[PDB]
């Protein structure tokens, strides 16, 4: 949060305030580049080309 | 012991009928963060004819047997109405926590009553979209059992104070709904009505459909006074009460004096005579004779 404002940071299922206390195992991170209008395609329950 | 010989029921004479229907089939059921209240009082109830499941998905009663609502009664019966999806009906349960149970409506851990929910997709499902329904999602702290909260403020997430800017790290707490017939059954709007009430020393004016019976004096009979059960003998009392007193106790703290709900007179309660039985025998080698001795 202290860094520059992100285009999309809405989080589902888990709240950032409660994200510090709760924790998981084997965090996976995936990085990719898309178009600006393709952000809506990158969403759970969304189908796109 | 002495066995009872008769059973008598004494209930106040009530002609007005409880308007339970009004809350169970109405039009503008409100949202979950602003659930509305209804204080049914002073009327004979008919849970019997409404236990009959019209379409009710759930009728789970906690703390009371569902089929025993008619004979007994409570004090100051309540009712709440709000609309919620099929998947969130489980979150309305005593003790159990949830995303919407901890932000809009939290039942007390000692709740008594029933969570009466049914389906509303047949009528309250617009093809264009039932977008008039909102539900709170964000709150600074947890709610309280039976808590009311209407005021809406711009949520602040950590740093970057909003001050009504709706900017970064700022979210509107209320979220819309997409209630349409096209969606799945698991997300259709469901109408939920929860009944809350309590049993109190103060007279319970609300009562179920039951018949009265004439008073009996100086006999071991079963008695019933506004749902209070027991066993004993009824005798006219001389202890002067007060115009606002109904029950009567003693050092052991057991109900021994009652005021008649019909004739408004003072009675007494006394358990039937009992005692130990002791037998005297001169032995089983000289005779089979005995001599019973009642203790008291």
């Amino acid at each position: 949060y202290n860094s520059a404002s992100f285009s999309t940071f809405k989080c589902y299922g888990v709240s950032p305030t409660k994200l510090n206390d709760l924790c998981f195992t084997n965090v996976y991170a995936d990085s990719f580049v898309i178009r600006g209008d393709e952000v809506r395609q990158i969403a759970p329950g969304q189908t796109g080309n | 012991r002495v066995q009872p010989t008769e059973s008598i029921v004494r209930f106040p004479n009530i002609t007005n009928l409880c308007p339970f229907g009004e809350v169970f089939n109405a039009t503008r059921f409100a949202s979950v963060y602003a659930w509305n209240r209804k204080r049914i009082s002073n009327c004979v109830a008919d849970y019997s004819v409404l236990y009959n499941s019209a379409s009710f998905s759930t009728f789970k009663c906690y703390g009371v047997s569902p089929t025993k609502l008619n004979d007994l009664c409570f004090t100051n019966v309540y009712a709440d109405s709000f609309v919620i999806r099929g998947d969130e009906v489980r979150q309305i349960a005593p003790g159990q926590t949830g995303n919407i149970a901890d932000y809009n409506y939290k039942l007390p851990d000692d709740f008594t009553g029933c969570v009466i929910a049914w389906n509303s997709n047949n009528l309250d499902s617009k093809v264009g979209g039932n977008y008039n329904y909102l539900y709170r999602l964000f709150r600074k702290s947890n709610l309280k059992p039976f808590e009311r909260d209407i005021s809406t403020e711009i949520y602040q997430a950590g740093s970057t104070p909003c001050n009504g800017v709706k900017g970064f790290n700022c979210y509107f707490p209320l979220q819309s709904y997409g209630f349409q017939p096209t969606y799945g059954v698991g997300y259709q709007p469901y109408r939920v009505v929860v009944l809350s009430f309590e049993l109190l020393h103060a007279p319970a004016t609300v009562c179920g459909p039951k018949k009265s019976t004439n008073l009996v004096k100086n006999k071991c009979v079963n008695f019933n006074f506004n749902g209070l059960t027991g066993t004993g003998v009824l005798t006219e009392s001389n202890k002067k009460f007060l115009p606002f007193q109904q029950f009567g106790r003693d050092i052991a703290d057991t109900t021994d004096a009652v005021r008649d709900p019909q004739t408004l007179e003072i009675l007494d309660i006394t358990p039937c005579s009992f005692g130990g039985v002791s037998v005297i025998t001169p032995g089983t080698n000289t005779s089979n004779q005995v001599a019973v001795l009642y203790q008291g």
Partner: protein
């Protein structure tokens, strides 16, 4: 003390047996009556030992 011990709930919804019987189904009422029975039996044992 033995008489006053009869008013405690011991974890049941109410300390009056008739009130539980007239307000709950037998399958649910049994588990409530069990706690009351255990509490009263414990009190009686203590009194006898003393």
């Amino acid at each position: 003390t033995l008489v006053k011990q009869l008013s405690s709930n011991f974890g049941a919804i109410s300390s009056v047996l008739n009130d539980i019987l007239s307000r709950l189904d037998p399958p649910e009422a049994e588990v409530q009556i069990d706690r009351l029975i255990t509490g009263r039996l414990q009190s009686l044992q203590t009194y006898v030992t003393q």
